[PDB]
Design a protein around this ligand. Structure first.
Ligand SMILES: [Mg+2]
Ligand SMILES: [Mg+2]
Ligand SMILES: [Mg+2]
Ligand SMILES: [Mg+2]
Ligand SMILES: [Mg+2]
Ligand SMILES: [Mg+2]
Ligand SMILES: [Mg+2]
Ligand SMILES: [Mg+2]
Ligand SMILES: [Mg+2]
Ligand SMILES: [Mg+2]
Ligand SMILES: [Mg+2]
Ligand SMILES: [Mg+2]
Ligand SMILES: [Mg+2]
Ligand SMILES: [Mg+2]
Ligand SMILES: [Mg+2]
Ligand SMILES: [Mg+2]
Ligand SMILES: [Mg+2]
Ligand SMILES: [Mg+2]
Ligand SMILES: [Mg+2]
Ligand SMILES: [Mg+2]
Ligand SMILES: [Mg+2]
Ligand SMILES: [Mg+2]
Ligand SMILES: [Mg+2]
Ligand SMILES: [Mg+2]
Ligand SMILES: [Mg+2]
Ligand SMILES: [Mg+2]
Ligand SMILES: [Mg+2]
Ligand SMILES: [Mg+2]
Ligand SMILES: [Mg+2]
Ligand SMILES: [Mg+2]
Ligand SMILES: [Zn+2]
Lengths: 122, 44, 53, 111
RNA sequence: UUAAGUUAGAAAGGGCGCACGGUGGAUGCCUUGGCACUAGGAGCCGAAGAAGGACGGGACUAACACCGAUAUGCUUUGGG
RNA sequence: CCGAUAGUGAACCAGUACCGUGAGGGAAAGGUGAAAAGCACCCCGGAAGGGGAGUGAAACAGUUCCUGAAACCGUGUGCCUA
RNA sequence: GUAUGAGUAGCGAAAGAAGGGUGAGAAUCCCUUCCACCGAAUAUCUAAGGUUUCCUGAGGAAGGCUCGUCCGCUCAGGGUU
RNA sequence: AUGAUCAGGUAGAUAGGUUUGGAGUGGAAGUGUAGCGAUACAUGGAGCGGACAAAUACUAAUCGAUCGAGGACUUAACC
């Protein structure tokens, strides 16, 4: 694995954030290495959602951030990222073995010349 | 580091003021020479 | 740790012979006809590998 | 009649940082030179791009030349009036800083 | 074909000559301001408030110059 | 007698700006053109800045604007160079 | 006045991420969510000192050790009972 | 360090994932039983498992572009 310019606690918090925005938005724009690292974590998480146990749900909840995706008229209660991961994203890839994400290169950033990409799960 | 200049309005006008200059023969000499050179501010 | 003699113009230019920058690795988008970088999404028609992004 | 030019006088970028990009589009067809300037990641590229497009436009309008048969005949960077600043160093002394400018000229002609 | 031998050419960059630009402000020319004097005049102002200032006055007013709540000015006698 | 590094510190809003608690120390900075006639209008640009057009004897006189040296920075090339 | 050192040293203690918006132009401006830091202070008043730095509408030449559509910066009107 | 070197670019196991393993740690969550309770036992060498191993084109190595020879003269041997 690669250190991303930050210590072990800050790196873990960065990876938990990025892996959650990919679940909620399905398409985000980040840098090159920062995307090549969340590629692995998002797919391990989707595998956990594929199993669909209670042990798997707890093990995924130990990594997902607790934030609302959208509020629905179910009484109108919200849904959270874990619910979407286990109810929407994981059933999509039932017949797919690996590679739930792809990376498409875009070009350098004006401010610091960082090579930006787009990572999006399909 | 405590520096050398610690400002105060009263401590400035009581030592360098106009009345302090005008209260002494040598202060009046200072005012006269500053008027001679042509300065905009006397004493102050 | 301080220059003994000043540097002449010839030596300065000789040192700067390698301080150029290369040429971008680009070609022409099939759909656009316009220029774009290889292995990148073209900014004009917004396509990659014959599919819209 | 056969050449057109445009200059950018006293641009804030320093000359040594713009010459390094000018040295890339010399003697090249304008269609390729615009793409050269678009895909190189430097700060001087937008300025030179604007100057080159101005030269092409006033070649097409003032003298009625063919766009598709144009090349970058010559391009150079000249020094401009520098601005003198200061930077407070340690132990009570200041150091000089030069905020340099430049003039950028490009000439397009048919080939 | 092979063996032995000889000599050209090259420029990533550089040197010299020339041509054309940029920066910089010398040199030339000029005078608005000074320097040294000559001839004449005048050599003091103030409690009837001085020298020097602060704040104000304009249709618009930051500054110079002028003026003082009669304030970018008032009355009178001459010039034009 | 000087002619803008000269002549007063000060030819220009100078005992100013700036420096110092204070007494006090104390600068830099002249010139478009005969006349603003100070570039209508078109084009590239967000603008600055340019290319035409026009005024002018001159715009390579376009608001540090008469002249415009040297250091210094570049572009092109005739002869030489691993 | 202009070079060489040289596109070199430095850019002054610290955690940010993504999604929308504005715009000619966005890592740097605005909004949302998550995360993180101080908490006998990095919180609330108030003297000295400063002297308009306060608020609103425009602005992007110079200042801001980068960028800037922003600002204790520039312009114009206000504001202290 | 960066260049460089080496293994690959669909004529594909180059990297990530996925499925089986392995080292390592050591008996997961949920439920049940015994006990007033801390706790203990069972389901069960269980669960987890960065970098290690083998399979597998699911994801990315797409598409294109650039450089790169036609070989001087003299003499000597079959020619
Ligand atoms: Mg910790
Ligand atoms: Mg040369
Ligand atoms: Mg006399
Ligand atoms: Mg007397
Ligand atoms: Mg009269
Ligand atoms: Mg002169
Ligand atoms: Mg003088
Ligand atoms: Mg003072
Ligand atoms: Mg004149
Ligand atoms: Mg204009
Ligand atoms: Mg001339
Ligand atoms: Mg003349
Ligand atoms: Mg010269
Ligand atoms: Mg060095
Ligand atoms: Mg550094
Ligand atoms: Mg800092
Ligand atoms: Mg952002
Ligand atoms: Mg804390
Ligand atoms: Mg404490
Ligand atoms: Mg006060
Ligand atoms: Mg202050
Ligand atoms: Mg102010
Ligand atoms: Mg404010
Ligand atoms: Mg700006
Ligand atoms: Mg800046
Ligand atoms: Mg302000
Ligand atoms: Mg290869
Ligand atoms: Mg593999
Ligand atoms: Mg196979
Ligand atoms: Mg085991
Ligand atoms: Zn395209």
């Amino acid at each position: 694995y690669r250190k991303l310019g930050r210590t072990s606690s800050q790196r873990k918090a960065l990876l938990r954030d990025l892996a959650t925005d990919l679940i909620v938005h399905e398409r985000i724009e980040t840098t090159e290495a920062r995307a090549k690292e969340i590629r692995k974590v998002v797919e391990k998480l989707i595998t956990s959602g594929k199993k669909g146990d209670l042990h798997a749900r707890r093990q995924a909840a130990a990594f997902i951030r607790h934030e609302v995706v959208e509020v629905v008229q179910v009484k109108n209660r919200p849904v959270y990222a874990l619910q979407k991961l286990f109810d929407d994203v994981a059933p999509r890839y039932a017949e797919r073995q690996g590679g739930y994400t792809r990376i498409l290169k875009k070009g350098p950033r004006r401010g610091d010349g960082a090579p930006m990409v787009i990572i999006e799960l399909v | 580091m405590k520096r050398t200049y610690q400002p105060s309005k009263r401590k400035r006008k009581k030592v360098h003021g106009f009345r302090t200059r005008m209260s002494t023969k040598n202060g009046r000499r200072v005012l006269a020479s500053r008027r001679r050179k042509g300065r905009k501010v006397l004493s102050a | 740790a301080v220059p003994f003699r000043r540097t002449s113009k010839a030596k300065k230019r000789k040192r700067r012979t390698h301080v150029k920058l290369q040429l971008p690795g680009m070609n022409e988008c099939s759909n656009c006809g316009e220029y774009r970088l290889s292995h990148h999404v073209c900014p004009e028609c917004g396509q990659y590998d014959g599919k819209d992004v | 009649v056969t050449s057109a030019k445009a200059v950018a006088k006293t641009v804030r970028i320093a000359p040594r940082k713009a010459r390094i990009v000018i040295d890339l589009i010399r003697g090249k067809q304008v269609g390729e030179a615009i793409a050269i300037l678009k895909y190189t990641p430097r700060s001087a590229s937008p300025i030179i791009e604007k100057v080159l497009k101005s030269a092409i436009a006033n070649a097409e309008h003032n003298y009625d030349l063919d766009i598709n048969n144009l090349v970058v005949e010559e391009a150079f960077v000249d020094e401009g009036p520098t601005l003198k600043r200061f930077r407070p160093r340690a132990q009570g002394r200041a150091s000089a800083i030069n905020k340099r400018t430049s003039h950028i000229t490009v000439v397009v002609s048919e080939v």
